[PDB]
Symmetry: D2
Subunit: 283 residues, 4 copies
């Protein structure tokens, strides 16, 4: 499987979106799992999940790696509402366009917020819910905010440079030996390719700050079986939010990886794939 | 598999133990996994692990459900050192007697302390380490101590009664509908059968209080791959100790079950069995 | 100062209350500080605050120790809304009847919930806010709920006995040597005197469970300078809620007493009095 | 009081130190309080405590603002042992030279580690103990380490620049409006004045990493009445260490300031001065 061989586009039409182009990477043909990426500059479906797509497909799932609005190859957009909710509407739009009745969702960070909003807004359209360090869940009981990683994300959006990208990735990942030339060059290309997405993201963030994303008060509504993962060493979203979700969602479990930053599905891909595939099969 | 069909005895000889009788339940014939029980009145190997032995054996392991010294059908003993260490010596004694070179250890509560001590004292004799709410790891950052469950455990040791047993089990388990007549009658029988074990436990606890069990300072020595589990709703050992282990052991992960008390391997047996078998196979 | 010499009654009329009798103990004549008690069986203003009234009066404050509706010498009531809000309406009713424009509030547990609700509903009527382990602020990130102390409070309400009272006080206080015959006899008398309050409390709790009390989502509205205290060893309301308040209220500080249960103003009266008087004077 | 008018030097002789020059600022003449500064580049007694010296002197204390070895105007040194212990020996050396029998200690960060080590090593020479975010107390249960602030401290030591200083101060303080030209210029001067201290600090840190500073296991030995303060928003030492100290020291209390970074005695000087003076007077 490659980015090119799996690449597809679909126009969506859903509450606010009109003939809006969504890019996604699709492989496999079984039960649908939609994987939703984080909000960093240059983020996208393939780049965030390419270590996961193969094993999930091998396990018999149809995997859709979705580019959220205003990221990668999806259409440019300025959002005046919190991104989790707007992104969730776009997932629903994609599912309607592709005739998908129910999907399992996997979401990291912004994608975790998207998945939570989707579960809240469209409970009859979700199977299981997999959350990796979801963002926007209000204050931490321990971590000063904005967190270290978030400050760097905003620096890189506002003043993109190769050096600042490197600094961000050093904070993003626990094991520094994972920061290869390939990773750096690839992430730098995606930032250079879409400067309009960078500008639009910053405008959107002024209109709807991270405080507007907090859906904590509604977590008791979630009826989906939920698997929460966290990196022990995540400098972007606070570990105690893993506990917040575990206490507030009816049927959840929490798995914390040691020696792991903000990209658990990539930093601990083998363990992540095994645990999440087992969850989808047996929970 | 039944208690009777799996029941075996072996005399051990190891640092302090001389021709000391250990009872254990054995099934299967592959790689050895020794499962170590908690310290409540009437506790033992079979009673604590009978929902786990079958699936582990099916997975190809040889399972040994060990009765710790001063419990169930093992010999009576008064201990003047912390139980985790004394119990670990007894595991080594059993392995030497049975010609077992290396074992995976699974330990709940007192059994978790036993397993940690074993990993520290005999690192060349352990494979992987599975810890379910290990006891004795010092103060909690949040929970007043002694914890609610521990107060009840001491009440039941000192004044055993059917009513006090019921009260303890209500705190021990999250889902009250798991407290069947069978569970109550069985636990009551094991308490009635061995009053000397109750008396000896209390004498031992005066000689070596829970504060003597704390091996926190040595956790950096543990080289075993470690899987830590906790019940979210454990009223016997504090949830934050799961974090303590995760930060201090080199190669660990933490899994927390929602709606789960102090007997995770029984209350969430299916998920526990799947996760731990996968860990032993693939980690 | 004695209970008898300070005892006063006033009829209140405020949203739901019609000619409703409120008992209070008053001393001093300066700036008004209203102290609000917890929700345990037999609780009241004088009993909960008699170690505080003198020093506050000496410092130049007018101290009002209010009996909440359905407690001690105030009128009996069955509440169908969360007690914090209903109690707050009663404080407003008292202040209107006594021609008090603004008051500083001190509230422990239920009284802390009352004080938070008062600050939210009537921001122009509050000076400073002092909270000692306020109750009803949703789940803990660490403590299983209901907490140990709360289970005992409900046991004592439903089946009042001298032995159960003693058990509750043992959990309520850290230092067991504070449980004198005087304390026990006094608390037992207040329970015996008002069996109707016990029955009504339990009916009220069925109509509006503790989950209905949670005002967390509104804490950002509080503009009062706030001093939060917690007992390190509080088995009734969880320590992490001290952090919740500290992160969510604009201008707060948190003080945690070691070796202290659920009655900090009594268990650490000297330090409590000094800190709170300094706060009222200088903050 | 000014830096110049209070400036004194004394040669010390104590376990490893031979005719070693210590600079300190002294004012007042009552009971001695020694204030101990943090470990950032350019740190010193006067600079760290000039908002505290006046009120403590007014309260009747003799205040000694000590420059630790290898800082400000004290002699240059390369340390091969953990700085807390070496610094404590230097405090003892100063007290012996000045004929001071007992001192109250106030210590922030490195100075908090110094004060803890002093209490452990010389219990008969300490009065009360005041700790503001002490450093080196092992891992956090929540914060990835090294913490954000610590990474910046090491960057500034290794590559001192005006821009990096500004970045560090932005993380060091919660309220950005406290970063005046005066603060920046002053801190920059102290860095420019003593480049040898910067180089020596880095050599020392290689010889004895922060892990060597951890005295957690010995906290039960501390018999001094202890007052622990923390900034809620401290990005240099983790908030949960405030809890660690509170649970492990016999007689402690914890006060947490909201809207406060790593320099609580300066950022919340009025409240800090009032609380600590009251503690010294009445505890
Ligand atoms: O995971 C990524 O792709 C990435 O580069 C990120 F930095 C993701 C971070 C978030 O999406 C994020 C959103 C919201 C929040 F509160 C915290 C973090
Ligand atoms: O799991 C059991 O069998 C049981 O009945 C227990 F209550 C086990 C508890 C412990 O072994 C225990 C030991 C030490 C400790 F600190 C806390 C709990
Ligand atoms: O402080 C008392 O008077 C007392 O006897 C109590 F047990 C008070 C407890 C509460 O008011 C309480 C209310 C709500 C809650 F969530 C937890 C505790
Ligand atoms: O407070 C200061 O003067 C300062 O500039 C600091 F950054 C102090 C920090 C420490 O001394 C420090 C030491 C050890 C540690 F683990 C964490 C922080
Ligand atoms: Na490499
Ligand atoms: Na049943
Ligand atoms: Na006494
Ligand atoms: Na200014």
């Amino acid at each position: 499987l490659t980015e090119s061989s799996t690449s597809k586009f679909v126009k969506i039409n859903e509450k606010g979106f009109s003939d809006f182009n969504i890019h996604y990477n699709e492989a496999g043909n079984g039960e649908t799992v939609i994987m939703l990426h984080g909000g960093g500059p240059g983020a996208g479906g393939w780049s965030n999940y390419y270590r996961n797509v193969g094993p999930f497909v091998d396990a018999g799932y149809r995997v859709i790696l979705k580019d959220s609005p205003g990221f990668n190859k999806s259409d440019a957009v300025v959002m005046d509402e919190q991104r989790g909710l707007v992104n969730a509407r776009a997932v629903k739009g994609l599912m309607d366009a592709l005739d998908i009745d129910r999907a399992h969702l996997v979401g990291n960070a912004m994608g975790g917020a998207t998945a939570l909003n989707f579960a809240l807004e469209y409970p009859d359209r979700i199977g299981k819910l997999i959350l990796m360090g979801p963002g926007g869940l209000g204050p931490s009981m321990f971590a000063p905010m904005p967190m270290e990683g978030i400050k760097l994300l905003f620096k890189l959006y506002a003043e993109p440079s190769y050096e600042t990208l490197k600094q961000m990735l050093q904070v993003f990942l626990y094991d520094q030996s994972l920061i290869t030339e390939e990773l750096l060059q690839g992430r730098w290309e995606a930032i250079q390719r879409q400067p309009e997405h960078l500008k639009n993201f910053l405008i959107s963030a002024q209109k709807a700050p991270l405080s507007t994303w907090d859906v904590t008060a509604r977590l008791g509504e979630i009826k989906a079986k939920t698997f929460i993962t966290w990196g022990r060493d995540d400098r972007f979203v606070p570990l105690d939010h893993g506990l917040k979700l575990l206490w507030n969602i009816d049927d959840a479990r929490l798995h914390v990886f040691s020696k792991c930053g903000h990209w658990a599905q990539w930093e601990h891909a083998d363990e992540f794939n095994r645990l999440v595939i087992d969850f989808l099969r047996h929970a």
